[PDB]
A paper describes a structure:
Phenolamides, also known as phenylamides or hydroxycinnamic acid amides, are ubiquitous secondary metabolites in plants. All these phenolamide synthesis enzymes belong to the acyl-coenzyme A (CoA)-dependent BAHD acyltransferases family, which was named according to the first letter of each of its first four biochemically characterized enzymes: Benzylalcohol O-acetyltransferase, Anthocyanin O-HCT, HCT of anthranilate, and Deacetylvindoline 4-O-acetyltransferase. It has been established that BAHD acyltransferases catalyze the transfer of acyl groups from acyl-donors (Acyl-CoA) to various acyl-acceptors. In this study, we first performed structural analyses on two representative BAHD family enzymes, the Arabidopsis mono-/di-acyltransferase-SDT (AtSDT) and poly acyltransferase-SHT (AtSHT), then explored the acceptor-molecule specificity and potential molecular mechanisms of multisite acylation by structure-based mutagenesis approaches, and, finally, successfully predicted and varified the acyl acceptor substrates of two uncharacterized BAHD family transferases in Arabidopsis using our prediction methods on the basis of a sequence similarity network (SSN) and of structure modeling.
In contrast to the mono- or di- substituted phenolamides, which seem to be widely distributed in different organs, the poly-substituted phenolamides, tri-substituted spermidine, and tetra-substituted spermidine were found to be restricted to the flower pollen coat. Spermidine/spermine hydroxycinnamoyl transferases (SHT), accounting for the synthesis of tri- or tetra- substituted spermidine/spermidine, have been identified and studied in Arabidopsis thaliana (AtSHT), Malus domestica (MdSHT), and Cichorium intybus. In addition, the multisite acylation mechanisms of BAHD-family acyltransferases also remain poorly understood until now.
Author numbering: 3 to 367, 378 to 409, 415 to 451
Write the structure that this text describes.
Amino acid sequence: PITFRKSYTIVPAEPTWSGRFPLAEWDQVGTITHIPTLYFYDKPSESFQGNVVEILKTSLSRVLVHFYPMAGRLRWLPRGRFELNCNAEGVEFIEAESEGKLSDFKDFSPTPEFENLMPQVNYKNPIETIPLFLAQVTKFKCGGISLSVNVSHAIVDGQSALHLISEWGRLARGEPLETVPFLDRKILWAGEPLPPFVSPPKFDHKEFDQPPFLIGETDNVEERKKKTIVVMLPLSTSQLQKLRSKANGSKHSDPAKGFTRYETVTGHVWRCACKARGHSPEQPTALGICIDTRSRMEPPLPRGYFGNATLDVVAASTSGELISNELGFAASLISKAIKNVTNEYVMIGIEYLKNQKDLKKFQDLYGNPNLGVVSWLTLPMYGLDFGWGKEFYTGPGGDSLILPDQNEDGSVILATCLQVAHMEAFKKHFYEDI
Ligand SMILES: CC(C)(COP(=O)(O)OP(=O)(O)OC[C@H]1O[C@@H](n2cnc3c(N)ncnc32)[C@H](O)[C@@H]1OP(=O)(O)O)[C@@H](O)C(=O)NCCC(=O)NCCS
C-alpha cells in the first residue's frame, strides 16, 4: 500500500571518466537484468536527527564517483555483444511513503506484493534509457524504513553489487572506502584476445551444451508457461549435520574433506526435485551452480574487481540415477563440477564464449527437468548502516537460492521456485527423505 512516490535522477558528484567501456564475456552472458535486494530498518532512535532521504541521495552521488560505470548506459554491438557507455547519465532514486506498518508484514522473505517497495524496470524500453542502478527508500507509517536496491547483472555479479552497496553505507557514515574498486576489465580480457593457449583446449564443458528438454517434447515452451511458486524452507543446524554425515558416509565423498553445506544441500535438492517431478528414469537433468572465479584464476582477480566474475557451471545426470543412488552420489556430482573450475577451465570457458557467433542464446532469465541452485551463503549482505542503525532484515527477491539464516548461525533457508504441481511432493521429500 503506497501513498506517495517521487523519482529523481542521481549523477556522480564530480566529473568522471567518460567514454566507451568494453565488457568481459561473463558480463554479456547469463543474467543481464537487475539483482534486487531489500533492507528493512526499525524507526531510527531519537538520537538521529539527520535527513534519511537526503543522506541517501548525497552519499549515492558521492559513491558514484568511485563506481562511475554504474551511472552509464548499455549499447548493443554486433553479434549479441554489448558494451558500456560511461556517460554519467545517472541512476534512478525513488522516495516513497506507505500507510502500512512494519508490523503488517507477515514475515520477511523474498515474497511478492513487495513490488510497491522495488523500483520496477521496463526491459522493452530502448537500452540507453534503462538505468543500471535503481533504489527506492520507503517510509512506513510508524517510522520503519525499507530500502530496495536493484543493480544490473549485465555490469556486476552479486559480489560486486554488494560491494557497491556496502561502500554506499560507509560513505553515508562519512568514513573512507573499505576496498577501492578495480574498474579496468582488461584484466579479464574485455574486448581483447586471450593469451595463446600452451596446449590446445578441449571444449567439453557441460555448460556449453543446451539444457535437455523433457523426453517427450522438442522445445520447452509448455514447461516455461506453467504456474510456479516460491516457498521458504528452513534447514536447522542439526538437519544439516544429518544430511552432511549421511553424504560423507558415501564412498563418493572426499576423505579428509567432507562435503560442504552447499554441496550437500544442492545434492539433496536435486534428488528431491527429481523425486517430485515423476520423470522417466532416463530423463536427462542438469543443475546450474554459480561459481565466483575471482580467487579461482591464477593470477587471481584484483581485490575489489568490479564486474561479472561469476560463471554458471553445469552438473548433469539422469533422474533415475539421482533418485536411485544414495545422497553422496548427487553431492559428488556437484562437488566434482566445482573442483573442475581451475584457471585453465575458466580460460577455456572465456575462449568458448569469445568464439561464439551470437551471445543472445546465452542471455535472459532453466526449469523442469533442469535446476539451478545459487549460493548466497558468503555474500557480504549484513550490517548496512547509513546510519540510523543496521537493518533488522535483508534479503534478495528454475533457480533456488541458499540463504544463510540471519538468526541462527550455521542454519540456512532454501528459497525454492518450483511448479505448483510438484511443490508439495518436493517439501515432503525435502524434510522426510533426509
Ligand atoms: C561454488 C561455491 C558455491 C561452492 O561453495 P562451497 O561448496 O561452500 O565451497 P567453498 O570452497 O567455497 O567453501 C568451503 C567452506 O569454507 C568456507 N569458505 C571457503 N572459501 C571461502 C571464501 N573464499 N570466502 C568465504 N568463505 C569461504 C565456505 O563458507 C564453506 O563453508 P561451509 O561448508 O561451512 O558452508 C562457492 O565457492 C562460490 O563460488 N560461491 C559463489 C556464490 C555467488 O557468488 N553467488 C551469487 C552470484 S550473482
